[PDB]
Amino acid sequence: HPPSYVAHLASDFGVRVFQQVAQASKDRNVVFSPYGVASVLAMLQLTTGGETQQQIQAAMGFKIDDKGMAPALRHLYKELMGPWNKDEISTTDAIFVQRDLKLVQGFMPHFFRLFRSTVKQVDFSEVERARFIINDWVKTHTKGMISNLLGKGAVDQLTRLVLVNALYFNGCWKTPFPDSSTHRRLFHKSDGSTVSVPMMAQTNKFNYTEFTTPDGHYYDILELPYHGDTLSMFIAAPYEKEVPLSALTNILSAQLISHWKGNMTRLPRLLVLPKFSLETEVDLRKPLENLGMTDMFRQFQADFTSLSDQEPLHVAQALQKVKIEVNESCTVASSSTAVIVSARMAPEEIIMDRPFLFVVRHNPTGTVLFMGQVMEP
Ligand SMILES: *[C@H]1O[C@H](CO[C@@H]2O[C@@H](C)[C@@H](O)[C@@H](O)[C@@H]2O)[C@@H](O[C@@H]2O[C@H](CO)[C@@H](O[C@@H]3O[C@H](CO[C@@H]4O[C@H](CO)[C@@H](O)[C@H](O)[C@@H]4O)[C@@H](O)[C@H](O)[C@@H]3O)[C@H](O)[C@H]2NC(C)=O)[C@H](O)[C@H]1NC(C)=O
Ligand SMILES: *[C@@H]1O[C@H](CO)[C@@H](O)[C@H](O)[C@H]1NC(C)=O
Incomplete structure (x- = not known):
């Protein structure tokens, strides 16, 4: 393992996803997290199989399952949860799932083993209760800072799968x-x-x-x-x-x-x-399709078999929100x-009185934690 081998792959993929997001945001403010989306997708690797898994491994450039990949990733998270973190950054990943689905044997324990945390079960047939819960878990896991991640708008009876990522x-x-x-x-x-x-x-x-x-x-x-x-x-x-x-x-x-x-x-x-x-809610669908990860939003094509064995599953909504x-x-x-x-x-005088770009890097590893452009401060 070249030092920070994984860290550099993640930030990388994380930055690539960002271009995407910036291309789609001409003249708007955006703040985004390369690390976050990289962590959340690394998790998703485990819920997937077939081409769906492939599209991600090809886009992320490592396989979550190989030797020391998950080991190196929780250590990364630890370095960033360091004692130096005088409450400067709160972070949250969450994969939510409709509530009566036979999870394939071994999934839970495996997921907990490589990632800690677990897949959260909810009842999407219960309308606004379900977002309410997702929104509450998010609020509280980001030191109260990020509220309405899941939009009053969309998500319905038929939603069965959702990823969330949120940083502050x-x-x-x-x-x-x-x-x-x-x-x-x-x-x-x-x-x-x-x-x-x-x-x-x-x-x-x-x-x-x-x-x-x-x-x-x-x-x-x-x-x-x-x-x-x-x-x-x-x-x-x-x-x-x-x-x-x-x-x-x-x-x-x-x-x-x-x-x-x-x-x-x-x-x-x-x-x-x-x-x-x-504070920017980024919808991940277009940026991810654009990097090759198409299958995962598509009924009859997405392969979630590493997670559930009563077929029909696809990602309904893949949102990151950052403050x-x-x-x-x-x-x-x-x-x-x-x-x-x-x-x-x-x-000499340097004046940022025009639109500009910002990057927050964790220095030892080179991880781009956050990224963005300021259009109208
Ligand atoms: C600092 O940043 C420069 C890049 O920025 C340039 O220099 C700065 C100071 C400003 O003047 C900018 O306006 C400039 O753009 C880094 O420069 C890059 O560094 C690497 C070495 O680490 C060098 O790689 C070499 O590549 C060649 C062949 O491969 C190249 O491939 C590209 C395709 O993109 C091709 O167009 C290019 O001309 C090359 O042929 C090999 O022969 C070497 O073995 C070596 O790998 C980059 O080419 C180089 N880029 C430029 C534009 O200079 C510099 O490393 C940074 N300093 C530090 C300390 O990191
Ligand atoms: C300037 O350059 C290097 C690496 O970023 C470091 O050794 C030094 O402490 C930096 N100083 C700053 C940002 O003031």
Whole structure:
């Protein structure tokens, strides 16, 4: 096992799924979790057989069943549930299933053995009760932060199978932003218009690098450490207002991000950054079909035989919902101000007053925990 061999495969697949999601979200805010969807699909591997299993193993690039795959994955989850987790991130996977289905012998114990947790049984014939329960389990397993994951809308008598994934993150900066150096400021939407939003400021030695699109536009990559350095945020945007964020989105990969960090250098800057707080339900169906995982939504074609042996089964709904707060510090509404040794020495100014991209990486492993674009802060 090359170090973090699995971790790198997951984040990877996780990033690939993300492109998909960004392609479908031009001009909208999105926050997403590469890790989450990777974990949830790894689980699903066990409920599946035939081509349905194949489509996933081919898309994820490892087989959950082989030697040390599940072993390495729970260890990953442990590293991320580390003691350093001062309640910064809550995480939840859940596979829900209609209630009177003969589960194939061995499934439960096996699932518990490789994954802990278990498949949750509910009665979808009971209308709104069933979502209510799914929504409650989700709320409580994400420190109350994510509510209505399962939409008042769809899911009916006939729904028999549903995956859910949900994360919440509110991280504590290594150096958090002065409260006093936060002031209003114009943010330029992509359509050129203009909006007055609160931007944070902090002047500091950042890790920094400048890359270029294939179409020859320059763009900034900036690393923000979180406490004790387990995680970092990466911020990226094209220099030129005129350039849509897509130029970046459409080329994002796991490897690109490596190149970014690899290629960084500590440099003094003044950083103006919008304070922001996003919550996005992502529907997984299209992104997954697009990576080859078609069978799993399809009656008469999906192969759930590793789970149930009274045929008819297919995934009704595959939802991830994510909330991320970035604003000054996780801390008791009030962060360490105000210090500044600022004459006319002014270091260069990087201002995120245009749409931009963010990435939260768990540093030892390289896992992209979260990912997103800020369109209107
Ligand atoms: C930092 O980032 C660069 C990539 O970004 C470039 O450089 C930065 C600083 C900016 O100037 C950007 O605007 C640039 O785009 C990383 O560069 C990549 O690094 C690897 C080495 O790890 C190098 O791989 C080599 O590949 C060749 C042959 O294979 C290639 O295949 C591609 C297909 O995409 C082909 O088009 C390309 O021209 C190559 O022929 C082998 O000969 C070597 O054995 C080696 O494997 C990449 O090619 C290289 N890319 C570029 C554009 O330079 C650099 O590693 C990062 N630094 C750190 C510390 O990670
Ligand atoms: C800058 O670069 C490397 C790896 O990210 C690390 O050794 C260093 O602590 C980083 N410093 C930051 C983000 O301030």
